[PDB]
């Protein structure tokens, strides 16, 4: 049978500031979900958070871009609003739902979504990312390594199931332009593109040999704003695809990604582990934002279909062998900071979300560099006097 | 509307030494001020210790230096110690308790009180801090960086809104005087003071746009015994004040702090997470005091205010990127330890809460130094002999 | 009033061999001494292991050496042995039990015992150590420094009252002589004897001031077999008497002591964290033993008395800082197990529990020096031959 | 007497690469300058580079931007050029020499300036800084660390002459305009401005006490091509002047810088010794450029100015303290290695100085985003077959 | 035959700021000494630096406080001042000659002096330290290790000839008195004077056997000024003296010690390597002070006497062993650094050398403690507005 899988994110309220969630809001929404699945809405749902972002991972069979769908989830965060996160005052209380009025798709609301439809497989083995305090393009790195990078993929070396290679639909976020590279054969041209990380962006993988989808990444044009949200990530594995282990080694490396305090500065993307995971309740809480609000984390869920229902999820970021990799990102975590306001710890300046430099340049004066040049020694004196 | 938040705190017993607060005597503080909840006293409260301290942190509507708040607050104390330390015979059963009698005022008594009152802002984000083993002074370097270092609070410079800076009520706790000093410009004068920690103290924080109060720590004036006692800290946060994350990363160097053993030594102030958080029964049981009575520690609890309701606490150095920041701290505390009673490990002489230099200079023998110097060879000789 | 504090410790077997204890072990004693208690023959009790030995600490008013105290003590380990040891054919069952009939004094029969007599103090703070793979004076260093080490207990500087010192009772375990030594003075005397750990054997403290009893080691002298057993250690604090931070900074550096593995080797002593502690059951699991039988572990657990009842007990190991701690125990264990074989990594002959030393001396072909260095060539010859 | 301090730095060829220099082309800048001395057109010179950067370090008194000392650079730079670096044909000979005729000043065609005009004082201490694979916004930390920073320079607290601050003239190297911005009030705005590294740069900066210059950084308006050349740094010190030791604190965290492989990435500013150091020969030679074309270094030489003599140097980076850092720097570069051509490792794309964008879009297919959504079955199975 | 041996030490000029020393002038004082030895004033000589204090060590029979021989020193200081420093305008040139007049004993006048007479044993080693930016009670804490701490010097223990102990002479440089305390009985006492390092300084020790001088630190009481400066160190061993191994591991913890930027800062005592040792030349080059114009770092020089020759100098920080305690120096300066202005890092305010706390009070309103509370609200919005 073909079933969609979808991911539908938003943060609708932090606790405090925007360091983690309330857990009132996870309950909330798993029961909503339940009844949705009661009335056969959706066959299945899982809720979690990571740092101040709620997931609702949902499956179903009503396609891709889905009006019923998105409004469910849409219903839901503004349900969780107004029950929960106004009633207790949470920090940016319906923060993400950028309009009064749902118009059929979410994407460009402000809540990131990632979706895939397909025929599900005698095996169905997928992964549920979240990451908090960064952007879209965070995920270009790990997603280039685990369908490119055959240090990364042993599969693309030694299976001959997955040597044909992947094709990569990127998006300019900018100028609102896709282009689809197929690796090995475009692997550097696709970087050209996806090292800049807040303009070109993966937006979805499949794979060569059949065109299956293989990945599905939240991203959605620049709007004035909206487009730098906290992604949601859903990947397939196995059986010509990343082996799940191929695809956590792709996160075993703590990049530097952009976000972190005020979406205006670059720390390094762990791979934490989930507090707790009920998978009867259908609720997962995810690690909180400290230091400067962050650094930035991401969290993996791992479930198994059967039918559209939802066996897991699994915390795939919890082994001693990712210990190294936290203790990697908290050590360069500790060095960037003892830069400050300085790049490239803090982002470039069309790039950061904050910035305070249209009030400066009102205030301070500015000298034409040649005219400045013949009277420097009286504009110093002037200052000392 | 109008909130009062108080935070007052005392150290009534040790279980065992000063290591850490008997479960019943939390408790029995969370029971009597439930009972005052209900009465109308108080809107909503949260008990809980970093080691042998319990902060009551209570919201209300009564204002600052409240006659029924204190009072509540002396009361607790009372039947804690007599209820519950000197039943157990807890060690320094009633240690903070320096009168028979409650004036109308617990500050001078030697509880610690920590206070801010202010209209409660569309989402209100607070964070409560306790420190055990070290003095009010041990809060001027994380509340100097938190608003006035521009490597640690990123808003100073990219959030036009906080670029005015802040206003630091400083009291000398020998002379009772109070400074007031505004950053960015008075920088180097503040430091000049609050450098000195054990003397000139950062007692408030307001910002300087509107006056808002932004922070208070407990600490009174010096008395003969009563002023170096451990101290409590309330931050407002976020719009305008620091991000929960900003306040948060004044804490990431574990810097050295003067307490620890017996009052009279310094080590590293280690971000510590609490032990367990209930917030249905209102009661964290925070970290213990262990190798050499410490090293001293600092808790931290966020909370989101609704009508004075407290909605937390959360802890907020649950994150690994604090392990890294408590391992540092453990690896100092060895190191420095190696010194032993060596400035400036120990306190400077004026400084240190014991001594017993008074029984050393009355049984060994002075010499003034310009008759010694013609007999040193006939002293000597009469210690050889 | 005057409280016996008196702790009785035996490995009755192990689970599996000598890695831990039968979890039934603990909850049978713990239930034969609440029928003590509710009998009158003790006050209040606790049970815990650390390793494979169980500590059954009482408190009680018959004094020191008494028959039915020590006989209770002796009577529970019969039973846990033949309920549960050798119901389970646990390793060593009944391993300490080295006579078939109580004499009247539990002391020399395998059982090891440290206790103290003594007026309750006004708050009456103490705590129970339990070291396994070890020898009673593995203790040495550790009560050398919180007595008598300025660098450890601050007190004996800053802390009039502690200005005079402590009187060691030093047991040699080999003679049967005792030594009484005070410190300052005797510091360089004391020393030169307990440094040799498994002959000179601190066991009791008394304060100089007043005589008070400060702390007992279980030791007894050397039996043909008895008196390597491992060991308890129980010591008061406070008020004169070291901090219970000076008594658990002696604990801070893990040195080498002897034991581990088949009671023939050096290793580092880890503070351990109990497993759990359970103050309303009174049982705490200790740590397990693991590679090559260790390290060596001391757990502590601290109390406060009050009419004889212990509150506690409470994890006297568990910060942060000891976590460092316990991976230099950790890293230093893995450097001096490279040495395999060797001393000083292997004991000395006179001081290893096994050797194959006499099978080897009557299967090996001796040469008189003299003679062989004239025949050397014949005999190698011989041996290619 | 007044003297003017001028470095002028060039690149004229590599050696293998952009790795270090040859010998014989300082041996050859140091002939000619002992000529230019003999004939008194300077007082006295210093030879070095780093990496592949030159450094002729000039005393005279013939004031800023004069032509004699900047043609004296050009000369002694050609004739390197076309004496040893075309003879060997070293890698980028000539490189930084921009056209065929001296104008009257080297600024802006392409060889890096730093000078100061001033009266000597009674000491005159000064160092003279030289960064290789890195730009001249790369000593914007540090200049501002050493003059504004009480973390940095004590000096600004308590340094009762220095607590005045300092004015920074900063160059938009974009738009052609200065900013005047003094510390500490104008401390937040200034770094409003030269966090953007790569726009606005500190190029001098004066006391504010009596306007006496401070410190001045080789930097000059972007042209097409120039101005990212790699920096020189000229800072004096002392009495009223960050200390030596302030001034090298502030280099002691190896911040990331942008440049390295290709100008085009981000990587630690490493804060290196001199390979050698001849007072003699007038002669140092500075490290090499190794792992991806670095990581960036900056060398630091000190000298004492007598009558425009130059005593020294000394190199000011050669401490153990300073292979923590060195070490810290090595580490840090092999972490951001592995993000291999992601941003914020390569920098972003108006920042870098190498990219086959342009080619890129001139080959890969970009679709409409709106089109390419209704028809991607289609665009997909256009690939796959 | 008795012969002295006296250091007497000055910085007269540093090289650049107070980094290090020029390399003329040791040459200048080595060949000045050579001229005193060649008209017998002086048996033997050597001339060494750390930092930028320069160390005359002579050797002669003049006895202790000679007129000719700190006539001499002084003379070979003021020549090296007016040939080498003011001619170079070295930083700081002739900083510590504090009269223009020698009165017959250096001692007073800023330089320092440590000297000590007694007959030369049948072999006489010798070690001579320096100490740079630091305080003569530096020394106190390796001082108290190798003649009191049994966990330093094991001759303590296992010597039978060094079982009775030392007399150490402790000067209070504040009072001007001397205390004569003995080890072992007197070590607590001894402690709670020598731990405030800043004003009880030993001065010399004594053997308890014999009387037999064996060490001699320089320090003069305070004056205005005087006093603080950096210290010079003699100590004999072996044979009934602490061993030279154990002297040195005296100074194998760097531990914290007052001094370092602006004599105003606690930092690591690094145990650093001579640049270069030329026994021929009498010269050896210590180490520099960069970061922060330190760590303070000190020089050990090994020598054997006979007939007060000086064989030698051999340099005994000169060991892989001695790496990781340079390593753990260079990472705890790091750590410390981070604190900035802030006690302890920053000295407490009766013991720093600088500071603008005068300036500060003349400008900044103190408000009595009493009126402010009632007008704070008023205080504020003065401010505000
Ligand atoms: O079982 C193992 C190894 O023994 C796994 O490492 C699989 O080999 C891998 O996950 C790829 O599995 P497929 O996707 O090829 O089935
Ligand atoms: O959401 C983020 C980043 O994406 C936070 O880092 C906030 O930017 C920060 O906490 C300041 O928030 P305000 O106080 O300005 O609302
Ligand atoms: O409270 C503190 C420090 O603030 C403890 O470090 C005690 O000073 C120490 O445990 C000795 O207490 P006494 O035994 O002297 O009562
Ligand atoms: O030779 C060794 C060891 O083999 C040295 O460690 C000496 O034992 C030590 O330096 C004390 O020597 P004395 O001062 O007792 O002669
Ligand atoms: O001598 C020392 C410390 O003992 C140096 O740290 C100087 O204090 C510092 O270099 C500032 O010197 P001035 O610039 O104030 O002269
Ligand atoms: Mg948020
Ligand atoms: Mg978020
Ligand atoms: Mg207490
Ligand atoms: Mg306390
Ligand atoms: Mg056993
Ligand atoms: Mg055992
Ligand atoms: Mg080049
Ligand atoms: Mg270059
Ligand atoms: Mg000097
Ligand atoms: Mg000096």
Redesign the pocket.
Same mark, same amino acid.
């Given at each position: 049978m073909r079933v969609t899988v979808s991911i539908i994110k938003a943060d609708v309220g932090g606790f405090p500031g925007h360091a983690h969630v309330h857990p009132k809001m996870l309950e909330y929404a798993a029961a909503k979900l339940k009844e949705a699945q009661k009335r056969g809405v959706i066959i299945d749902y899982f809720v979690y958070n990571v740092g101040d972002d709620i997931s609702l991972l949902m499956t179903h069979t009503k396609g891709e871009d889905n009006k019923d769908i998105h409004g469910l989830a849409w219903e839901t965060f503004k349900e969780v609003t107004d029950q929960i996160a106004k009633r207790f005052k949470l920090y940016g209380a319906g923060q993400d739902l950028l309009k009064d009025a749902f118009s059929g798709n979410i994407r460009g609301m402000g809540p990131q979504v990632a979706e895939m439809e397909f025929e599900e497989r005698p095996s169905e083995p997928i992964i549920a990312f979240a990451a908090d305090k960064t952007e879209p393009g965070a995920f270009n790195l790990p997603l280039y390594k685990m369908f490119a990078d055959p240090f990364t993929t042993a *599969?693309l070396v030694i299976?001959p199931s997955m040597h044909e290679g992947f094709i990569f639909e990127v998006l300019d976020v900018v100028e609102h332009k896709v282009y689809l590279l197929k690796t090995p054969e475009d692997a550097y041209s696709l970087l050209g593109l996806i090292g800049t990380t807040g303009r070109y962006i993966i937006r979805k993988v499949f794979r060569r040999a059949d065109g299956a989808p293989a990945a599905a990444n939240s991203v959605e044009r620049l709007s004035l704003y909206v487009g730098k949200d906290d992604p949601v990530l859903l990947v397939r594995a196995?059986?010509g695809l990343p082996?799940? *282990?191929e695809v956590l080694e792709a996160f075993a490396h703590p990049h530097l990604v952009h976000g972190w305090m005020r979406g205006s500065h670059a720390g390094p993307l762990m791979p934490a582990r989930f507090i707790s995971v009920d998978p009867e309740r259908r609720i997962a809480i995810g690690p909180k934002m400290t230091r400067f609000d962050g650094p930035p984390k991401v969290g993996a869920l791992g479930f198994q279909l059967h039918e559209g229902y939802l066996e897991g999820g699994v915390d795939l970021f919890d082994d001693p062998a990712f210990d190294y990799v936290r203790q990697t990102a908290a050590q360069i975590a500790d060095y960037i900071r003892r830069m400050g306001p300085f790049q490239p710890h803090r982002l470039p300046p069309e790039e950061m979300e904050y910035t305070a430099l249209p009030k400066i340049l009102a205030k301070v004066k500015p000298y034409p560099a040649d005219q400045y040049e013949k009277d420097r020694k009286k504009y110093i004196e002037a200052v000392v006097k």
């Open positions: *599969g299976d196995q059986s082996a799940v *282990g």
